[PDB]
Amino acid sequence: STASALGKLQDVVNQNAQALNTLVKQLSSNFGAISSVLNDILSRLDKVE
Amino acid sequence: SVYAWNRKRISNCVADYSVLYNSASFSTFKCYGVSPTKLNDLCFTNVYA
Numbered sequence: 001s002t003a004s005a006l007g008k009l010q011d012v013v014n015q016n017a018q019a020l021n022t023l024v025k026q027l028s029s030n031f032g033a034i035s036s037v038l039n040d041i042l043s044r045l046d047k048v049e
Numbered sequence: 050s051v052y053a054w055n056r057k058r059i060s061n062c063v064a065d066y067s068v069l070y071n072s073a074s075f076s077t078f079k080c081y082g083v084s085p086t087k088l089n090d091l092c093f094t095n096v097y098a
Contacts, residue, residue, distance in 0.1 A: 044087055
């Protein structure tokens with residue numbers, strides 16, 4: 001009947017899931033670059049700049 | 050004139066930037082966000098001149 005009686009395991013799983021999720025989400029940050037996709041900046045620029 | 054610069058819209062066309070790129074009649078050919086030679090593969094819409 002009682003829910004959330006197993007909080008520790010759920011917390012561990014949630015921690016792992018959110019770590020992976022934010023790691024995935026970091027892929028869409030300019031970091032100062034003009035874009036966050038390699039192919040597009042490669043296809044629009046030249047191999048010096 | 051300087052204060053009354055003229056605007057043109059370009060859409061629904063086919064563009065060949067290579068011929069004008071090879072043309073030496075232009076004193077300065079300075080492209081900012083893309084490589085001048087990489088214009089023949091990527092294409093856009095609502096070109097403003």
